[PDB]
Amino acid sequence: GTILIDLSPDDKEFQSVEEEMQSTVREHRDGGHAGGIFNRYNILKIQKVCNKKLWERYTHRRKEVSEENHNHANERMLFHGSPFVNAIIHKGFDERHAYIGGMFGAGIYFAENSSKSNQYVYGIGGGTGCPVHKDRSCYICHRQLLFCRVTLGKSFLQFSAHSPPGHHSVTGRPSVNGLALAEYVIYRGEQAYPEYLITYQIMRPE
Numbered sequence: 001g002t003i004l005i006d007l008s009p010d011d012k013e014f015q016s017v018e019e020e021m022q023s024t025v026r027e028h029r030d031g032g033h034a035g036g037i038f039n040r041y042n043i044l045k046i047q048k049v050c051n052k053k054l055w056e057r058y059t060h061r062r063k064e065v066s067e068e069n070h071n072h073a074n075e076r077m078l079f080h081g082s083p084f085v086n087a088i089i090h091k092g093f094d095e096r097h098a099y100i101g102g103m104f105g106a107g108i109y110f111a112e113n114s115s116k117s118n119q120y121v122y123g124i125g126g127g128t129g130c131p132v133h134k135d136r137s138c139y140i141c142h143r144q145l146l147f148c149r150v151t152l153g154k155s156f157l158q159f160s161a162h163s164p165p166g167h168h169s170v171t172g173r174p175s176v177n178g179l180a181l182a183e184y185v186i187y188r189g190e191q192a193y194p195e196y197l198i199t200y201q202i203m204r205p206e
């Protein structure tokens with residue numbers, strides 16, 4: 001029972017979601033190989049993802065993690081880029097959205113850097129690119145990102161399935177690229193809510 005409400009760009013909500021998308025762009029060590037070459041996005045549409053069953057699935061698990069961690073759910077707003085975004089907004093996150101070949105295990109991956117999530121919009125390493133031009137740096141086709149409410153709880157810090165014992169998620173602390181932001185991994189689909197569906201294009205630097 002998913003409903004997508006279009007957010008007006010006049011709305012304070014559109015303005016704060018676009019600002020978290022824009023300000024969290026960074027240069028990638030692959031030179032744009034996976035996500036393309038760009039410094040900003042053309043934000044075409046921001047939509048609120050409304051689903052009573054999934055929101056309840058998430059706040060139920062949130063209350064569990066909170067009570068297991070001195071009433072702190074450790075809730076973040078993170079980006080999620082995946083070829084299975086359209087399936088996530090209707091069925092939620094689960095074991096089919098888990099990244100088997102992940103660095104922090106077979107869990108569901110999230111990023112603080114929007115530009116990081118953009119690397120997985122067309123698949124692992126950007127796949128073959130957009131389905132129309134087979135271009136990983138395509139500047140034409142419309143891309144789609146999720147801005148998710150994530151319950152991290154007790155997160156296992158990793159400097160560089162199931163969660164480490166006595167923990168609720170894993171934090172990928174960046175230990176080489178001094179400008180990278182953290183990456184997070186949850187092992188329960190219930191621990192995340194697909195809050196915002198952002199439609200956009202990467203923009204050719206001038």
Ligand SMILES: Cc1cc(=O)[nH]c(N2CCN(c3ccc(F)cc3)CC2)n1
Nearest residue numbers: 079080081082097098099109111117120
């Ligand atoms: C680091 C990071 C940030 C981000 O936004 N997204 C992701 N992924 C990881 C890989 N994914 C995946 C899911 C299910 C599969 F079958 C294969 C891949 C989805 C998106 N990673």
Ligand SMILES: [Zn+2]
Nearest residue numbers: 130133138141
């Ligand atoms: Zn294209």
